[PDB]
Design a protein around this ligand. Structure first.
Ligand SMILES: *[C@@H]1O[C@H](CO)[C@@H](O[C@@H]2O[C@H](CO)[C@@H](O)[C@H](O)[C@H]2NC(C)=O)[C@H](O)[C@H]1NC(C)=O
Ligand SMILES: *[C@@H]1O[C@H](CO)[C@@H](O[C@@H]2O[C@H](CO)[C@@H](O)[C@H](O)[C@H]2NC(C)=O)[C@H](O)[C@H]1NC(C)=O
Ligand SMILES: *[C@@H]1O[C@H](CO)[C@@H](O[C@@H]2O[C@H](CO)[C@@H](O)[C@H](O)[C@H]2NC(C)=O)[C@H](O)[C@H]1NC(C)=O
Ligand SMILES: *[C@@H]1O[C@H](CO)[C@@H](O[C@@H]2O[C@H](CO)[C@@H](O)[C@H](O)[C@H]2NC(C)=O)[C@H](O)[C@H]1NC(C)=O
Ligand SMILES: *[C@@H]1O[C@H](CO)[C@@H](O[C@@H]2O[C@H](CO)[C@@H](O)[C@H](O)[C@H]2NC(C)=O)[C@H](O)[C@H]1NC(C)=O
Ligand SMILES: *[C@@H]1O[C@H](CO)[C@@H](O[C@@H]2O[C@H](CO)[C@@H](O)[C@H](O)[C@H]2NC(C)=O)[C@H](O)[C@H]1NC(C)=O
Ligand SMILES: *[C@@H]1O[C@H](CO)[C@@H](O)[C@H](O)[C@H]1NC(C)=O
Ligand SMILES: *[C@@H]1O[C@H](CO)[C@@H](O)[C@H](O)[C@H]1NC(C)=O
Ligand SMILES: *[C@@H]1O[C@H](CO)[C@@H](O)[C@H](O)[C@H]1NC(C)=O
Ligand SMILES: [Zn+2]
Lengths: 679, 72, 136, 68
């Protein structure tokens, strides 16, 4: 309650100055700096809507956010134990090697949250497009691309539609590298899951290391190149020299003063809270960097003596040194130059500190250490599962959301176009077919909590453009992944000339101060991974590189049905809506009940939700397969469904008035009927 | 309509030559394995109507498609 | 009135009685009525309620077989049923709207069981139409 | 003792027998809310306790017939 009233006095003050800012016109201004401050304050954003539509939008955003954080999943063998997303469902997807338990956690969660977020997400697209078109954008996707826009600074301009071509032009140069990584992981996953993965097909969506396949970083224990070499870990050398909580930051401050950057501000050491306190003190323990204002910079984290938090100390100090540099600009220009620069400057501090060249000079590695070429492959493949493995996921998701907002995908094809783009761009196939009652994008955090996702694509490309430009200034000689910018001064002067700009200059002007180009480039990212790309092309000499978008993990127990309505009845035949598909799924579930009772002597309660229909066409054709009533992993074999349909084919024909030539089960033929009578 | 999955009330005798060109412009690979019978009249109006092959093969095939076929 | 009647129910004024005569329609060749046939009957009624609300009331409502509540199953093959909104257990569809839904799809329910409107009787619903003629 | 009942308008709020489901049945005057709490609870717990209770009758009759 002390921060909600003090938080609302800041928000009520800003809308009062925002409605004062439209007193000044915007095109009668000449100075570029005072124009940039005026446009960032004049921005209407919401409030352009009707006041009853504005409260409907905030009700949807609160409902979608609390469904994602309060979802219970029930274990079909004990309905008294519900697992909720972050504790328990994320641990199954990150640690299990059981095919049937990973397939259960994927499906369940998906389906449930899916359905909910569906109607809500559908109402969310209409209200967000109204708010964007009242602010003179064409849709809400064009509103998100307004961060990268640059207007009239003599040669540094950038259009909001130009971002779409630069993402797709840079992506088709990563596809050679991603195809060889996709082929190597597929060959290593066939040893972990035999009889489940095709050697020329896509990867199943529930075997990728987490709930959505965003990062492949949990596949390292199955895909490690040389498992008899320990990946270098300096955590024991920290607890053997009695390093306190303070040594990890004091060695971090000596890294930044080594390159020619200022010290910490000396208010940094009292006000900050570098560990959780000596009290058992309830205090959100999450690494972060605060910029309260008035030259007061604090870091909040709960650091343990590990090389993990030795590295994120270098990451979180990088946010501080970026913040201390642009503190001389006016107040409305104290951000990063775009949304992607702020995280990218933090991660080139972490790459330079994790090298074994830096660790043996900072006192943490035996001066008699030998780096072999087998351990550099182990290190580079662990990087590519996080860096390269997330780039087709990020590109596909923002491409789907951009086409939904402008209307290239109507709402009857949201889940049809989503899974076609998974097979084609990412190379990932779903294990169970999903119709237009699911909403699988909205089961991710950034989609249901209203966040932009293209900042994770551009940050990955800026990160290696910065690192390659700084290592030419530090006079590096070897590969790019061995580089360290310690003890230099000329590299820091190359870095400091960008850090102090803020938002006062266009971001394309900020890139030439470091890299020497006006656009994002993918060639520094590929130079980092050329020792891996050379080794990967030799491991895929007998493999197949690429994938087929036709294979599915369910499409060998499926039966194709073809229906010819106008041949059987003609001018008098009903039309095939989705109420006829409901009656077809109940007739097949009835035929499976009669087969298991009269032949196998069991009673099994098949329903219409256990018949899974895929690939519905206009000629009236689809595939279907039958599943055990609540075990989603148990598919009834194709030979037992053919025997069940043969037993009750005369009953299914009568429910639709068809005659075995207008209702074809492809692969099942009519057999009997000997003729005669004359004795 | 079975190789490309179209509804039945769109492909007929008036536009068969129109839409078969639309199928090789859409899927040139899936159109190659399909077969198309070449048949036109004056090839069915000129056949083996040899001796003892008209009253027994030509007439008795057409009688079974009239109603009250044991009478004819 | 002191005492009570064991015949009244809070649902038995929106129920419809169904009577099925299998051996009259087929005779020596008729299937036997197990509880898999009761599952197919509850899906055919849920299909008929879906078609009535779509083509007359312009709404899409997802009726299932669990929304058709069957009571008083006898050997002659007779029971009562009433229809309920899909998850609102307190919302009973009125008897006049289920009679209009069954009249719309009676020819489709008969074909699923091979009955002919004298072997599948909905008590209170009668066949009406059919004027004869042709001689001009 | 561990049964959750879901409110068909918000599946994210499950009520468990002694706090919440006993208060509806003892205080409400709404016909449709008392009819919901009765049915739901019933049905669910019902089904579960069914197979178990059926297996319970056979084993308890064996123990009683061995004690004459
Ligand atoms: C308007 O633009 C001018 C230059 O285009 C800015 O002028 C500079 O102002 C700072 C302090 O305000 C001086 O130290 C510089 O010497 C000035 N530069 C020149 C070339 O004279 C001016 O600051 C801009 N207006 C605002 C409000 O920032
Ligand atoms: C903020 O919203 C206002 C509307 O409340 C937008 O404004 C108007 O500007 C037009 C000229 O283009 C005037 O004719 C109207 O009088 C203004 N609004 C009214 C009726 O008061 C304004 O364009 C929006 N600003 C932004 C950020 O685009
Ligand atoms: C690491 O370096 C060693 C030393 O060159 C490599 O061993 C050579 O491998 C090639 C190809 O198999 C052979 O033709 C050479 O004869 C090997 N050298 C010796 C001295 O035996 C090794 O392949 C490298 N490993 C990686 C992963 O690059
Ligand atoms: C990079 O910077 C470090 C830190 O100043 C230098 O480390 C010193 O190295 C000398 C000899 O190698 C030692 O006598 C000092 O004790 C080290 N200083 C500290 C603080 O540990 C290192 O030499 C520098 N690298 C180069 C090439 O000059
Ligand atoms: C769901 O079905 C799968 C089979 O598709 C079951 O997995 C079997 O589990 C048993 C023991 O748990 C193993 O001996 C089998 O080898 C498994 N089969 C396969 C194909 O892996 C699973 O147990 C079923 N789940 C439930 C709750 O019945
Ligand atoms: C379930 O159906 C009942 C009706 O059987 C609904 O109760 C109605 O509720 C509205 C407002 O809540 C009242 O104006 C009506 O008078 C009520 N009808 C009766 C007969 O009492 C109930 O709202 C429905 N529940 C849901 C979740 O839709
Ligand atoms: C930074 O602080 C150290 C001592 O903490 C001091 O020796 C050094 O001179 C400082 N850096 C500068 C540029 O003054
Ligand atoms: C069949 O479909 C095509 C494409 O929708 C259409 O152009 C054509 O007219 C249709 N044929 C009919 C309606 O007979
Ligand atoms: C498709 O086949 C026809 C002949 O049937 C041919 O004339 C045409 O050029 C073919 N089209 C393509 C794209 O190969
Ligand atoms: Zn960060």
């Amino acid at each position: 309650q002390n921060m909600n009233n003090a938080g609302d006095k800041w928000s009520a003050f800003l809308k009062e100055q925002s409605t004062l800012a439209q007193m000044y016109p915007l095109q009668e201004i000449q100075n570029l700096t005072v124009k940039l401050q005026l446009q960032a304050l004049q921005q209407n954003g919401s409030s352009v809507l009707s006041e009853d539509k504005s409260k409907r939008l905030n009700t949807i955003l609160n409902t979608m956010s609390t469904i994602y954080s309060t979802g219970k999943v029930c274990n079909p063998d004990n309905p008294q134990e519900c697992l909720l997303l972050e504790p328990g469902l994320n641990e199954i997807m990150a640690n299990s090697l059981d095919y049937n338990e990973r397939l259960w956690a994927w499906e369940s969660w998906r389906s449930e949250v899916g359905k909910q977020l569906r109607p809500l997400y559908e109402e969310y697209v209409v209200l967000k497009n109204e708010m964007a078109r009242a602010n003179h954008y064409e849709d809400y996707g064009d509103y998100w691309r307004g961060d990268y826009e640059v207007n009239g600074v003599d040669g540094y301009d950038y259009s909001r539609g130009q971002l779409i071509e630069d993402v797709e032009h840079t992506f088709e140069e990563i596809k050679p590298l991603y195809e060889h990584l996709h082929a190597y992981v597929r060959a290593k996953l066939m040893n972990a899951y035999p009889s489940y993965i095709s050697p020329i097909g896509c990867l199943p969506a529930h075997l990728l290391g987490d709930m959505w396949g965003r990062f492949w970083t949990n596949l390292y224990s199955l895909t490690v190149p040389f498992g008899q070499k320990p990946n270098i870990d300096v955590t024991d050398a920290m607890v053997d020299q009695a390093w306190d909580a303070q040594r990890i930051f004091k060695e971090a401050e000596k890294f930044f003063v080594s390159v020619g950057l200022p010290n910490m501000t000396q208010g940094f050491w009292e006000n900050s809270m570098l560990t959780d306190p000596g009290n058992v003190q309830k205090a959100v323990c999450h690494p972060t960097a605060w910029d309260l204002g008035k030259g007061d910079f604090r870091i909040l984290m709960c650091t343990k003596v590990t090389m993990d938090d030795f590295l994120t100390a270098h990451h979180e100090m990088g946010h501080i040194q970026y913040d201390m540099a642009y503190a001389a600009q006016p107040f409305l220009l104290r951000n990063g130059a775009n949304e992607g620069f702020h995280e990218a400057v933090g991660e080139i501090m972490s790459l330079s500190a994790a090298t074994p060249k830096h660790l043996k000079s900072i006192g943490l590695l035996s001066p008699d250490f030998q780096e072999d070429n087998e351990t550099e492959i182990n290190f580079l493949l662990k990087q590519a599962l996080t860096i390269v493995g997330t780039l087709p996921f990020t590109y596909m998701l923002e491409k789907w959301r951009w086409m939904v907002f402008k209307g290239e995908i109507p709402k009857d094809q949201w889940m049809k176009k989503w899974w076609e783009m998974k097979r084609e761009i990412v190379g990932v196939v779903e294990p169970v077919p999903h119709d237009e009652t699911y909403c699988d994008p909205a089961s991710l955090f950034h989609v249901s909590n209203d966040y932009s996702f293209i900042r994770y694509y551009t940050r990955t490309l800026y990160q290696f453009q910065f690192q390659e430009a700084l290592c030419q200034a530090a006079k590096h000689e070897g590969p790019l992944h061995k580089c360290d910018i310690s003890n230099s001064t000329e590299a820091g002067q190359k870095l400091f000339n960008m850090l102090r700009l803020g938002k006062s200059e266009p971001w394309t002007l900020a890139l030439e101060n470091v890299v020497g180009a006006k656009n994002m480039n993918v060639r520094p990212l590929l130079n980092y991974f050329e020792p891996l790309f050379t080794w990967l092309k030799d491991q895929n000499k007998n493999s197949f590189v690429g994938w087929s978008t036709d294979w599915s993990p369910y499409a060998d127990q499926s039966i194709k049905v073809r229906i010819s309505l106008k041949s059987a009845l003609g001018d008098k035949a009903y039309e095939w809506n989705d109420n006829e598909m409901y009656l077809f799924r109940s007739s097949v579930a009835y035929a499976m009940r009669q087969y298991f009772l009269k032949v196998k002597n069991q009673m099994i309660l098949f329903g219409e939700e256990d018949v899974r229909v895929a690939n519905l066409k206009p000629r009236i054709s689809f595939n279907f397969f039958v599943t055990a009533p609540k075990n989603v992993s148990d598919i009834i074999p194709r030979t037992e469904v053919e025997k069940a349909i043969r037993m009750s084919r005369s009953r299914i024909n009568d429910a639709f008035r068809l005659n075995d030539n207008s209702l074809e089960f492809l692969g099942i033929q009519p057999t009997l009927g000997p003729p005669n009578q004359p004795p | 309509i079975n190789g490309f999955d179209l509804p039945e009330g769109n492909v007929t005798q008036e536009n068969f030559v129109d839409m078969q060109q639309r199928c090789n412009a859409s899927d040139p690979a899936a159109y190659a394995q399909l077969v198309f019978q070449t048949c036109d009249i004056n090839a069915f109006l000129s056949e083996a109507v040899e001796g003892t092959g008209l009253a027994f093969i030509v007439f008795t095939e057409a009688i079974t498609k009239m109603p009250l076929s044991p009478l004819w």
